[PDB]
């Protein structure tokens, strides 16, 4: 079961409905969350009339969740943001394939626009937004040894004033459902019908459909995709609690009771949660006051456990044991693999330092994979395809270095390379990035053509 939850934010209420739902009706007892910033239930033993009474609905509709940037730098500017990915997501509530939109706040890339259909890139000026920057066409799905199928970046479109956001999102929409290749599938996405028609085609009848022209995109830079664990200072006297999340699985541990910790937290939390696309937790808007109350509560139930730069910045789908498409163990392998990384950075001297690290339990990738700087794709049990070269910011699709190799061999790539990065790098200069210069991968450049060697 998966719940149409536009932004992530979620009412303390309506997380106490779910956490109950969870730990009775449901085979596993957890709360997983997604990196579309929503949550699932494994193995339902119905479940829309307990969401419907909090005011929730689980989503033949080809839309999925509307991502929306969690924890702004500027936090003023997360309301409006909020709002319209809400707007949006009504407006297109009820197409060839599914379609993924995401209103993003520079400079964070959390919910890495590059893996959706439409994007939304706010621009502000004096603590307002204006409009927003569109691209179109980012998708990772690619089938293994398919040729015709690839993972793809998103296309600056151009710029819109904030009145016509709505006719823009469903002129893409309605020209990518009628454009849409009609009988295969795998190439049914807004990514292959843009690289059939080409992006000015494309843009042109968008243009004409919405009413409008596009201005020149307006500048934006993304600095990272991290979420900010720990405190941050929010808006007025209010604070915001990132909880970094293994694998966004929230159940009782021996020792660590983070679903009852949870729960605690939501009972005495002002404001509400923030389901973040790093499949994280934000307790959002708690007032200085309640900062050492709430701190007090997620420090005993495990959920503030320090871990290392580089576990905070890797991810994993879920794959096993529940999902019937997988190849590879995904989030059942993160932790323990990512225990052995810490070590290679330790060893290297850099233990403070990250590299966007995740892994997809197959092809349809889901964990993310093609847009990290070093990515493992499932091709099956033990064995994945090591892909290298994306960057920190997610703008580069990893071009595949070693296929359908086991962990040990993964490990032995991996504690060289990151050796030569420790030694060789340039001042700040990431992983993804000293791979492509070192020579060590060729880039992808044009992922349609040159994905593939
Ligand atoms: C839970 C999640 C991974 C995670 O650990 O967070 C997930 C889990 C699954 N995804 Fe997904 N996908 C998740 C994000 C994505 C992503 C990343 C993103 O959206 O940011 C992608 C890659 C980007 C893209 O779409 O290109 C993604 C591409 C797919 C695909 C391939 C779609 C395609 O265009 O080819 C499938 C398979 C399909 O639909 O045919 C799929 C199918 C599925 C299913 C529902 C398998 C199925 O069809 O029965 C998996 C459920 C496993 C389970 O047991 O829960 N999922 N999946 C995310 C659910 C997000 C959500 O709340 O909606
Ligand atoms: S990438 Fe494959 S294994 Fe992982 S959750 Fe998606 S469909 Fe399942
Ligand atoms: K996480």
Not at 132 to 150: D, P, Q
Not at 350 to 366: A, F, K, L, Q, Y
């Given at each position: 079961?998966?719940?149409?939850?536009?932004?992530?934010?979620?009412?303390?209420?309506?997380?106490?409905?779910?956490?109950?739902?969870?730990?009775?009706?449901?085979?596993?007892?957890?709360?997983?969350?997604?990196?579309?910033?929503?949550?699932?239930?494994?193995?339902?033993?119905?479940?829309?009339?307990?969401?419907?009474?909090?005011?929730?609905?689980?989503?033949?509709?080809?839309?999925?969740?509307?991502?929306?940037?969690?924890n702004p730098y500027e936090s003023?500017?997360?309301?409006?943001?909020?709002?319209?990915?809400?707007?949006?997501?009504?407006?297109?509530?009820?197409?060839?394939?599914?379609?993924?939109?995401?209103?993003?706040i520079?400079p964070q890339?959390?919910?890495?626009?590059?893996?959706?259909?439409?994007?939304?890139?706010?621009?502000?000026?004096?603590?307002?937004?204006?409009?927003?920057?569109?691209?179109?066409?980012?998708?990772?799905?690619?089938?293994?040894?398919?040729?015709?199928?690839?993972?793809?970046?998103?296309?600056?479109?151009?710029?819109?004033?904030?009145?016509?956001?709505?006719?823009?999102?469903?002129?893409?929409?309605?020209?990518?459902?009628?454009?849409?290749?009609?009988?295969?599938?795998?190439?049914?996405?807004?990514?292959?019908?843009?690289?059939?028609?080409?992006?000015?085609?494309?843009?042109?009848?968008?243009?004409?459909?919405?009413?409008?022209?596009?201005?020149?995109?307006?500048?934006?830079?993304?600095?990272?995709?991290?979420?900010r664990?720990?405190?941050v200072?929010?808006?007025?006297?209010?604070?915001?609690?990132?909880?970094?999340?293994?694998?966004?699985?929230?159940?009782?541990?021996?020792?660590?009771?983070?679903?009852?910790?949870?729960?605690?937290?939501?009972?005495?939390?002002?404001?509400?949660?923030?389901?973040?696309?790093?499949?994280?937790?934000?307790?959002?808007?708690?007032?200085?006051?309640?900062?050492?109350?709430?701190?007090?509560?997620?420090?005993?139930?495990?959920?503030?456990?320090?871990?290392?730069?580089?576990?905070?910045?890797?991810?994993?789908?879920?794959?096993?044991?529940?999902?019937?498409?997988?190849?590879?163990?995904?989030?059942?392998?993160?932790?323990?693999?990512?225990?052995?990384?810490?070590?290679?950075?330790?060893?290297?001297?850099?233990?403070?330092?990250?590299?966007?690290?995740?892994?997809?339990?197959?092809?349809?990738?889901?964990?993310?994979?093609?847009?990290?700087?070093?990515?493992?794709?499932?091709?099956?049990?033990?064995?994945?395809?090591?892909?290298?070269?994306?960057?920190?910011?997610?703008?580069?699709?990893?071009?595949?270095?070693?296929?359908?190799?086991?962990?040990?061999?993964?490990?032995?790539?991996?504690?060289?390379?990151?050796?030569?990065?420790?030694?060789?790098?340039?001042?700040?200069?990431?992983?993804?990035?000293?791979?492509?210069?070192?020579?060590?991968?060729?880039?992808?450049?044009?992922?349609?053509?040159?994905?593939?060697?």
């Amino acid at each position: 079961l998966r719940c149409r939850l536009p932004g992530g934010v979620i009412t303390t209420k309506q997380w106490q409905a779910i956490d109950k739902f969870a730990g009775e009706n449901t085979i596993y007892g957890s709360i997983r969350l997604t990196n579309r910033q929503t949550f699932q239930f494994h193995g339902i033993l119905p479940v829309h009339q307990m969401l419907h009474s909090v005011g929730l609905d689980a989503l033949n509709d080809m839309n999925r969740n509307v991502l929306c940037t969690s924890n702004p730098y500027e936090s003023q500017l997360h309301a409006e943001a909020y709002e319209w990915a809400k707007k949006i997501s009504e407006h297109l509530l009820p197409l060839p394939r599914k379609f993924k939109t995401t209103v993003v706040i520079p400079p964070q890339n959390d919910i890495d626009l590059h893996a959706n259909d439409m994007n939304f890139v706010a621009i502000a000026e004096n603590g307002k937004l204006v409009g927003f920057n569109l691209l179109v066409g980012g998708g990772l799905s690619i089938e293994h040894g398919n040729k015709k199928t690839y993972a793809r970046t998103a296309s600056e479109f151009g710029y819109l004033p904030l009145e016509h956001t709505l006719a823009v999102a469903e002129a893409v929409v309605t020209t990518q459902r009628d454009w849409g290749n009609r009988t295969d599938r795998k190439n049914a996405k807004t990514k292959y019908t843009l690289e059939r028609v080409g992006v000015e085609t494309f843009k042109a009848e968008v243009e004409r459909r919405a009413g409008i022209k596009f201005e020149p995109i307006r500048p934006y830079e993304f600095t990272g995709r991290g979420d900010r664990i720990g405190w941050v200072k929010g808006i007025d006297d209010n604070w915001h609690l990132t909880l970094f999340i293994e694998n966004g699985r929230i159940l009782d541990y021996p020792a660590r009771p983070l679903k009852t910790g949870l729960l605690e937290i939501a009972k005495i939390h002002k404001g509400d949660f923030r389901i973040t696309a790093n499949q994280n937790l934000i307790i959002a808007g708690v007032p200085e006051s309640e900062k050492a109350k709430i701190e007090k509560i997620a420090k005993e139930s495990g959920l503030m456990n320090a871990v290392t730069p580089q576990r905070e910045n890797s991810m994993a789908c879920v794959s096993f044991p529940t999902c019937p498409l997988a190849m590879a163990e995904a989030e059942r392998f993160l932790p323990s693999f990512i225990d052995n990384i810490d070590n290679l950075m330790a060893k290297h001297g850099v233990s403070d330092e990250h590299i966007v690290m995740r892994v997809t339990g197959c092809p349809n990738g889901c964990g993310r994979a093609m847009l990290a700087e070093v990515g493992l794709v499932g091709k099956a049990p033990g064995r994945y395809n090591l892909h290298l070269g994306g960057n920190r910011i997610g703008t580069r699709i990893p071009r595949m270095y070693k296929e359908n190799i086991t962990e040990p061999e993964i490990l032995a790539s991996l504690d060289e390379l990151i050796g030569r990065w420790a030694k060789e790098r340039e001042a700040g200069e990431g992983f993804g990035d000293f791979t492509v210069r070192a020579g060590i991968i060729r880039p992808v450049l044009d992922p349609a053509r040159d994905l593939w060697d």
